[PDB]
Amino acid sequence: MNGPIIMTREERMKIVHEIKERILDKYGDDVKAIGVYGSLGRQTDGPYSDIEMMCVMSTEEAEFSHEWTTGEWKVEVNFDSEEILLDYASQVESDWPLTHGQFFSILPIYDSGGYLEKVYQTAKSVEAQKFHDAICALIVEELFEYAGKWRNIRVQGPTTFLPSLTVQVAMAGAMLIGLHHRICYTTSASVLTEAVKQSDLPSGYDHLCQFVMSGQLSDSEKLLESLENFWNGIQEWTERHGYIVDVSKRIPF
Amino acid sequence: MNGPIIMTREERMKIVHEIKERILDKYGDDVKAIGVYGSLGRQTDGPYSDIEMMCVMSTEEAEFSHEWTTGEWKVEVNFDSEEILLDYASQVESDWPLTHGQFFSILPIYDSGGYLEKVYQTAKSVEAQKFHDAICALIVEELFEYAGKWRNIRVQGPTTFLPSLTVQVAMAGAMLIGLHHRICYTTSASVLTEAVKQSDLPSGYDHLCQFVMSGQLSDSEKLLESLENFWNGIQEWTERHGYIVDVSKRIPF
Numbered sequence: 001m002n003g004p005i006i007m008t009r010e011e012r013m014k015i016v017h018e019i020k021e022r023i024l025d026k027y028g029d030d031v032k033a034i035g036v037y038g039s040l041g042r043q044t045d046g047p048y049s050d051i052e053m054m055c056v057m058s059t060e061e062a063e064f065s066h067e068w069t070t071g072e073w074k075v076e077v078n079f080d081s082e083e084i085l086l087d088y089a090s091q092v093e094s095d096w097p098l099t100h101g102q103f104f105s106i107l108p109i110y111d112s113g114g115y116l117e118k119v120y121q122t123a124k125s126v127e128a129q130k131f132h133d134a135i136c137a138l139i140v141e142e143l144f145e146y147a148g149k150w151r152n153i154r155v156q157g158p159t160t161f162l163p164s165l166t167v168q169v170a171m172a173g174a175m176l177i178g179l180h181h182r183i184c185y186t187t188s189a190s191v192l193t194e195a196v197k198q199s200d201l202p203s204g205y206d207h208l209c210q211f212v213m214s215g216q217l218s219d220s221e222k223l224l225e226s227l228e229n230f231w232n233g234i235q236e237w238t239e240r241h242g243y244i245v246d247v248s249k250r251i252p253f
Numbered sequence: 254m255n256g257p258i259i260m261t262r263e264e265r266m267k268i269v270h271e272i273k274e275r276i277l278d279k280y281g282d283d284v285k286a287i288g289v290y291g292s293l294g295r296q297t298d299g300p301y302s303d304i305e306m307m308c309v310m311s312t313e314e315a316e317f318s319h320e321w322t323t324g325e326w327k328v329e330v331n332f333d334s335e336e337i338l339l340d341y342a343s344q345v346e347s348d349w350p351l352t353h354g355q356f357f358s359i360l361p362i363y364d365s366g367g368y369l370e371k372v373y374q375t376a377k378s379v380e381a382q383k384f385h386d387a388i389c390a391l392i393v394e395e396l397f398e399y400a401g402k403w404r405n406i407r408v409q410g411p412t413t414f415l416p417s418l419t420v421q422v423a424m425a426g427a428m429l430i431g432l433h434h435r436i437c438y439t440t441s442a443s444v445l446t447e448a449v450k451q452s453d454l455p456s457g458y459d460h461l462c463q464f465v466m467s468g469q470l471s472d473s474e475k476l477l478e479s480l481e482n483f484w485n486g487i488q489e490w491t492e493r494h495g496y497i498v499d500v501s502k503r504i505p506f
């Protein structure tokens with residue numbers, strides 16, 4: 001296989017509708033809705049883009065997927081019950097700004113009763129408290145953890161991990177900003193470009209992203225300085241915005 | 254919080270045993286085993302390392318965690334029923350080389366009767382077919398996907414994502430090598446260093462990793478050329494080792 005080929009939107013939609021009819025052929029009345037990702041209200045695609053689709057099933061507990069290649073293109077189809085999909089659309093994880101923008105660009109191509117619009121409405125109406133909870137979790141589970149990793153590199157190496165770690169920290173910072181502003185980034189590739197455009201960034205984040213976006217990640221001393229500056233900015237920024245991590249317990253149970 | 258502080262192994266093990274005693278007081282006879290994993294269960298922990306612990310519970314369906322910081326250090330304790338943990342230890346995902354080293358480096362600190370040995374034996378006895386399937390899935394779900402992403406960047410940008418994408422591709426290549434050689438990498442920091450030391454590397458992989466490990470990721474033309482060369486190396490390497498991705502179906506269901 002030669003990897004993904006160039007295709008037009010029209011050629012991709014022909015493939016999409018073939019899959020739609022095959023889903024209806026195989027699963028019949030158990031299909032509530034079929035949608036294609038990236039096709040409502042937008043084209044941020046590309047000549048080499050793969051195909052992703054979602055299928056709402058009537059079967060309780062249905063949760064499976066088919067992901068395959070023809071050698072020329074790749075497809076992913078996820079099959080979920082309405083309940084499982086609505087639950088997922090309302091959960092705010094650390095990478096919500098990366099993952100849940102898809103729920104606003106699903107093109108319904110089969111829907112027997114407003115199911116995909118209900119998923120869209122559920123994804124759009126998430127409680128503000130959930131973003132506060134996710135931000136506090138991210139600080140502990142990701143950022144504090146990354147700070148230990150780069151401080152270990154400072155004292156014991158390996159500096160050969162520092163470029164990869166710096167990329168990971170910049171992405172976690174983009175999630176923090178996206179959660180704060182309730183922004184779902186358009187694509188994986190646009191995460192950093194859209195993150196640094198937002199107002200009220202933690203101090204040092206934009207400086208860190210300059211290394212990651214330019215690819216100038218070979219000066220380990222500069223990266224460690226920029227990481228520490230960003231970590232200090234996180235402390236001031238979270239304190240200022242009231243994202244207060246509980247530090248009062250040695251053991252929280 | 255001032256970020257993670259320096260601690261000695263002795264200081265960390267004192268905290269581990271304090272947490273052990275609190276787990277036994279709170280959850281009582283439902284606790285079957287407590288272990289420490291990561292580089293502390295391996296006695297190679299760094300000065301800034303966090304603490305990761307695992308608990309085996311008798312409680313049916315138990316699957317929860319406590320993850321917190323004191324402001325000075327961070328702990329994650331995972332609590333799983335025996336059935337859930339053994340099922341997880343026997344599943345081989347794309348990132349098995351990153352996640353499942355926990356099961357081969359368990360330092361027992363409490364065991365009511367061989368529970369941690371059962372976990373190790375389950376992780377060690379996984380059938381070769383599961384690694385074959387995981388490798389074929391990785392090629393489709395990760396590498397083929399990444400090829401579309403950098404080929405899109407070549408024709409429409411943004412090159413500002415290329416350093417991050419290249420890091421991701423190098424990590425996916427390391428997962429492929431780890432699955433093939435049944436290697437669980439010791440730490441996330443050592444993944445690329447240990448990956449390029451293995452025999453039977455796909456052509457172009459070592460060259461790509463040099464960019465990522467040195468942090469010289471600013472030459473977009475060189476990266477795109479190196480990514481294509483690695484993608485070709487994957488095709489030759491998988492055919493030679495019999496990791497054949499099925500391309501004979503436009504729709505496989």
Ligand SMILES: NC[C@@H]1O[C@H](O[C@H]2[C@@H](O)[C@H](O[C@@H]3[C@@H](O)[C@H](N)C[C@H](N)[C@H]3O[C@H]3O[C@H](CN)[C@@H](OP(=O)(O)OC[C@H]4O[C@@H](n5cnc6c(N)ncnc65)[C@H](O)[C@@H]4O)[C@H](O)[C@H]3N)O[C@@H]2CO)[C@H](N)[C@@H](O)[C@@H]1O
Pocket residue numbers: 052063067076078079080084085088098099100101102185186187188189394398
């Ligand atoms: N189906 C509803 C819901 O899904 C839940 O599961 C999640 C997630 O666990 C699961 O990941 C899939 C893997 O399990 C599988 N082994 C391989 C698949 N390829 C995974 O699909 C998801 O993750 C990939 C990431 N490579 C997404 O693809 P891609 O990079 O091309 O992303 C395209 C656009 O989507 C956005 N984006 C970027 N990264 C992600 C991630 N990690 N997740 C979701 N969206 C992402 C970004 O804007 C980019 O431009 C792929 O799209 C995605 N499907 O997949 C689902 C989430 O759909 C649970 N199973 C359950 O709660 C329920 O079924």
Ligand SMILES: NC[C@@H]1O[C@H](O[C@H]2[C@@H](O)[C@H](O[C@@H]3[C@@H](O)[C@H](N)C[C@H](N)[C@H]3O[C@H]3O[C@H](CN)[C@@H](OP(=O)(O)OC[C@H]4O[C@@H](n5cnc6c(N)ncnc65)[C@H](O)[C@@H]4O)[C@H](O)[C@H]3N)O[C@@H]2CO)[C@H](N)[C@@H](O)[C@@H]1O
Pocket residue numbers: 141142145291305316317320329331332333337338341351352353354355438439440441442
């Ligand atoms: N408990 C058994 C089993 O676990 C399953 O869940 C998975 C996974 O979903 C889960 O991830 C946790 C998140 O859900 C949670 N929001 C935050 C936790 N911190 C996550 O823990 C796991 O992911 C982090 C990654 N930041 C790991 O930390 P770190 O880089 O410091 O890892 C330290 C060293 O350990 C190795 N390692 C192991 N897993 C990983 C991952 N995923 N990424 C990177 N490195 C990893 C590596 O060598 C590194 O140097 C953290 O260790 C990890 N626990 O956690 C578990 C898998 O452990 C299900 N919940 C269920 O099937 C069942 O409970």
Ligand SMILES: [Mg+2]
Pocket residue numbers: 050051052398
């Ligand atoms: Mg995709």
Ligand SMILES: [Mg+2]
Pocket residue numbers: 141145329
């Ligand atoms: Mg962790």
Ligand SMILES: [Mg+2]
Pocket residue numbers: 145303304305
């Ligand atoms: Mg950790």
